[PDB]
Ligand binder design. Structure first.
Ligand code: MET
Length: 531
C-alpha cells in the first residue's frame, strides 16, 4: 500500500528546558524520515510538546507565572533547540493547539459511544512526574526533596502519591486478548525484541481498567474538559497520545504553521504511524494503552513502536544539580553537528543505555569520520591521484576489484533492512564495514604509485573508489545530512543522483563526470587532540 510514511517522536513535557533525551528521540525520528525521503517516499515526520497536566501546571506555579505563558515559553525553547539541531521535522505539534483539542473530544466521544468508558473510581498510587498509575508492586520506600521518608516509583524513582477519586474509566481489561493477538500476529511491531517480550508478559498477567479522567481541581484546571462533564479533565496521556492522530489530520503550509484540520485521516494518508520512536520509559502508554484506544475507536494500529534507552555522561546520571551536564548544542558547536549526531546514533543501540565521554567522542570522530570516511574522500578527490578531476572510465576488473564491487552492490539492501527494523546503529556499522574495505583496497592498490606506473590500472581503482564513496555517502546521508552534501559536491555528483533508489545502484554516476573544485585549506572532519 502506497501512503505517506508517517514517523513520530514522543511529544515532550514542558516542565523544564529541553535536553539530550528529547534531542536524541527527535534525532531518531528525523533520521528515519530522512532515509525514507532519500528512497523517494512521501514522508511526514512529527514532534512536539505535551503541555497539559498536573506536572506542567505545577512546574508553572513553582516559577510563579501562568500556564499559558509558561508552556508557550518552554515550547519556544524546544522549537529553537530543534531548529538549532538542524532536523527536518515536518511539523511541531502542541497539545494546547485548539485543533488537537477538537480531535481529543472526538476520540473520547468515540470511546464512550463504543461503550468502553464508564464512571468508576481509582484508588491507588500515582506518579505525578510520570503521570503514571502504579500498582503497589511498582512502588518502594525513598526520600522526598525534604529528605523525609516517602514512597517512590520503582520505574523512575519519583515521588508517588495516593489518589482516591471518582474518575471516568476506560475498559482496558476488555482488550487483553485483542492486544495479545496483535503482538503475536505482528512480531515486528515492538522493537527491540526483548521489549516486545516485556509487553507481552505484562499483558499476559492481566490488565486493569485505566482512569481516563481526573477531578478538575487536581489538574489546576490545566487540561481538556471531558465532553459533557466539565467537572472532569481528560487524562493527560489520552490527550497526549491523540497528538499522533491530530498530526495525521493537519494540513501544514510551507512556513510550518497548521492551516486546516481534515475530518477523516484517510484524506492525508498518514495514519497510522509506520514508526513511533519512543524511549523505554513510556513503553506501556504506546504498546498497551494506545492500541487499546485505537481498537476501541475502530482506528488502525501503528506498524512499529521502537523504544530506545537512556543516556549517561562519563558513566554518571545526567542532572544539573548533581554536577554533570550534557548539552547537545554546546557539544555540536565544539565537535560538529553531523559528528555529534553520528556519535549518538553509532555509540549505542536501542537495546542499550549509551555513554558519552569526550574521550570516546574524539575517538570516533578521529577514527571513523576523519581516518575512515574523510581520508577516503580526500584520496579519491586529490589532484595527486585524480589528475584530471573527473570520474575515470574503468578498465578490466580483477577478482580483488570485484570482491569490493560486490560489497558495494550488496550494501544498500543490507542498510535498507537495518533502517527498516529500525536499527540505525547496525545500518551505520554496515556502511563503515564497506568504507573500511574500500580503504584496505586503496592501501593495497597504492593508486599514488599507479599515476606514473599504470595509468590504465589507476582508472579502474579510482573509479571503484569514487563509486564506493558515493554509495556509502548516499546511505549515510540521513546520519550526516550536511556533510553528505559536501562530499557529493567534492565528487561532483549531480543533484538528481543524490536521492532515489535508482541511485543505490553501482554505476549510476557516469564516467567523465567532473569533480567539484578543491579549496586551499578544506578538510571534511578535522581531527581533535586528546587533552
Ligand atoms: C504521546 S508521547 C508523551 C510523552 C511524555 N510527554 C513524556 O515526556 O514522557
Amino acid at each position: 500500500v502506497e501512503k505517506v510514511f508517517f514517523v513520530t517522536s514522543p511529544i515532550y513535557y514542558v516542565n523544564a528546558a529541553p535536553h539530550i533525551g528529547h534531542v536524541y528521540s527527535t534525532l531518531i525520528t528525523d533520521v528515519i524520515g530522512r532515509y525514507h525521503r532519500v528512497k523517494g517516499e512521501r514522508v511526514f515526520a512529527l514532534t512536539g510538546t505535551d503541555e497539559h497536566g498536573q506536572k506542567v501546571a505545577e512546574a508553572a506555579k513553582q516559577k510563579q507565572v501562568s500556564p499559558y505563558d509558561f508552556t508557550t515559553a518552554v515550547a519556544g525553547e524546544f522549537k529553537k533547540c530543534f531548529e538549532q539541531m538542524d532536523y527536518s521535522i515536518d511539523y511541531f505539534i502542541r497539545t494546547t493547539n485548539e485543533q488537537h483539542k477538537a480531535v481529543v473530544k472526538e476520540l473520547w466521544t468515540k470511546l464512550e459511544q463504543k461503550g468502553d468508558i464508564y464512571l468508576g473510581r481509582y484508588e491507588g498510587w500515582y506518579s505525578i512526574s510520570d503521570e503514571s498509575f502504579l500498582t503497589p508492586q511498582n512502588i518502594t520506600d525513598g526520600v522526598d526533596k525534604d529528605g523525609n521518608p516517602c514512597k517512590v516509583s520503582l520505574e523512575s524513582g519519583h515521588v508517588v502519591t495516593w489518589v482516591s477519586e471518582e474518575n471516568y474509566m476506560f475498559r482496558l481489561s476488555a482488550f487483553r486478548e485483542r492486544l495479545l493477538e496483535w503482538y503475536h500476529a505482528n512480531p515486528g511491531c515492538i522493537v527491540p525484541e526483548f521489549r516486545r517480550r516485556e509487553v507481552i508478559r505484562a499483558v499476559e498477567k492481566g490488565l486493569p481498567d485505566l482512569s481516563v479522567s481526573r477531578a478538575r481541581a487536581t489538574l489546576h484546571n490545566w487540561a481538556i474538559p471531558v465532553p459533557g462533564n466539565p467537572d472532569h479533565c481528560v487524562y493527560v496521556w489520552l490527550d497526549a497520545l491523540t497528538n499522533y492522530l491530530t498530526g495525521s489530520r493537519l494540513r501544514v503550509d510551507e512556513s510550518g504553521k497548521e492551516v486546516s484540520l481534515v475530518d477523516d485521516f484517510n484524506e492525508l494518508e498518514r495514519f497510522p504511524a509506520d514508526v513511533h520512536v519512543i524511549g523505554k520509559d513510556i513503553l506501556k502508554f504506546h504498546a498497551i494503552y494506545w492500541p487499546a484506544f485505537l481498537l476501541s475507536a475502530g482506528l488502525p494500529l501503528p506498524k512499529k513502536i521502537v523504544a530506545h534507552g537512556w543516556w549517561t555522561k562519563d558513566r554518571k546520571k545526567i542532572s544539573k544539580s548533581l554536577g554533570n551536564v550534557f548539552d547537545p548544542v554546546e557539544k555540536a558547536e565544539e565537535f560538529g553537528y553531523d559528528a555529534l549526531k553520528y556519535f549518538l546514533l553509532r555509540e549505542s543501540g536501542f537495546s542499550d543505555d549509551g555513554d558519552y565521554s569526550d574521550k570516546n567522542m574524539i575517538a570516533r570522530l578521529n577514527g571513523e569520520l576523519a581516518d575512515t570516511l574523510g581520508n577516503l574522500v580526500m584520496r579519491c578527490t586529490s589532484a595527486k591521484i585524480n589528475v584530471n578531476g573527473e570520474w575515470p572510465s574503468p578498465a578490466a576488473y580483477t577478482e580483488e576489484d570485484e570482491s569490493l564491487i560486490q560489497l558495494i552492490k550488496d550494501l544498500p539492501g543490507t542498510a535498507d533492512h537495518y533502517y527498516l527494523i529500525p536499527d540505525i546503529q547496525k545500518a551505520i556499522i554496515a556502511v563503515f564495514d564497506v568504507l573500511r574495505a574500500i580503504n584496505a583496497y586503496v592501501t593495497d592498490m597504492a593508486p599514488w604509485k599507479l599515476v606514473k606506473t599504470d595509468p590504465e590500472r589507476l582508472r579502474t581503482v579510482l573509479y571503484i573508489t569514487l563509486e564506493g564513496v558515493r554509495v556509502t555517502t548516499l546511505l549515510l546521508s540521513p546520519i550526516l545530512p550536511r556533510k553528505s552534501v559536501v562530499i557529493f559536491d567534492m565528487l561532483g555528483v549531480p543533484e538528481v543522483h543524490r536521492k532515489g533508489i535508482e541511485n543505490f545502484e553501482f554505476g549510476a554516476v557516469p564516467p567523465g563526470t567532473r569533480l567539484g573544485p578543491a579549496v586551499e585549506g578544506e578538510v571534511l572532519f578535522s581531527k581533535r587532540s586528546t587533552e
